[PDB]
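question for whoever is on the cluster today: can someone run the full assembly for these? two chains, 432 residues total. i dont have access anymore since they changed the login thing
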Amino acid sequence: SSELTQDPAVSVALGQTVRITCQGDSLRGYYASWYQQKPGQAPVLVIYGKNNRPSGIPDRFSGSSSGNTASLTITGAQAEDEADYYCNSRDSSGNHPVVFGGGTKLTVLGQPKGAPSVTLFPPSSEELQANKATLVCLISDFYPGAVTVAWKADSSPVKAGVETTTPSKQSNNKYAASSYLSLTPEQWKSHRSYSCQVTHEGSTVEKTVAPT
Amino acid sequence: QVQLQESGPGLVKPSGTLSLTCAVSGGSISSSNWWSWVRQPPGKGLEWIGEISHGVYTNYNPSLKSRVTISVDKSKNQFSLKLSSVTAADTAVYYCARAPPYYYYMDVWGKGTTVTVSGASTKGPSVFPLAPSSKSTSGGTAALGCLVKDYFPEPVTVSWNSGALTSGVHTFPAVLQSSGLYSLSSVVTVPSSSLGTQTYICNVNHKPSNTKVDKRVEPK
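^ ran it for u. tokens below:
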């Protein structure tokens, strides 16, 4: 429940038109403003007032409003339109505080698949001098944003000491993730190698490091 | 041409007072504009905090009214936010923004500053070089980086060569370990032919713990 309500999720195919709606009793008499937000960045104003658009926002963003509702329309959606969208206005009660909608996560369907790029770093000599050891497996540029990570000491699967991040959206709308294998310096030096195996859409990429 | 920049402590103890400042350039702070504060908890929606205009008229979110103060320093052309009696529900990224005096909107935003409310103590990270080698070198391209290990709280900023190196840089989101400490890595992709000539240095800054380190990354 909110003063400004909007659907939490909506999808659109590449090149198609989607419309995001905002409803609230404050919208009669206050024109809603719309904001686009990509993960990790500040919100960006895209539409305000009566289909008024700030300088620099592409023409495919338009806005409308009727009654107690406001609508943001994205005509011919591109990949760079995938983001969260918030509506916003002032309340009609009291001294008119600013109220935000809950947010709408827009998914742009039909984007091309991307295979993960994997880089595996061995423990640094400085960390080993500190009686610690960390294997760093960096995964980037994969789409869709679902990956499973498997670690192996020599050839045997390893689950202890593994901490993996959730995938996060990059600037190019692909996803990134990292996985850390914590070891004692004795474990690292007493094995022939360790491997990070990254599986994505049924295909697997493996990187291997060894003490030397 | 107005630009905004937040600045804050990063960590605030429970029931303490959060204090932030926003530096304003390209516009007088005494203008008819409504200088505003907005926050956003991790993974949650935006919440409006308050606004001030002419350095006199304030308007606050009713759910926060008794705890919020927004002030203006005309000599420094800044405005500030103070939130008292904080709890974990106040852990969020805080933005300063600008609204005009006629429709409402916030067209100019700051970069945002992270504040976490927690009773735990700060923790400075160890910065380890991730050295390039033949195993991290595919073609005429080499990968090197820095491991920023065991810090609290978020965030950590990582640049390369004092910001003069931006192409090929990828700073990954941090992992939250079972110990409650964060660790992240930043990797840069460079021509493997430049390894013997170009010096590569990662600039790590963790303000909550006063940890500012420039770590040189060399091939062993």
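summary bc i know u wont read the tokens: The domain at 5-109 of chain A is CATH 2.60.40.10 (Immunoglobulin-like). Residues 33 and 48 of chain A are 4 Å apart (CA to CA).
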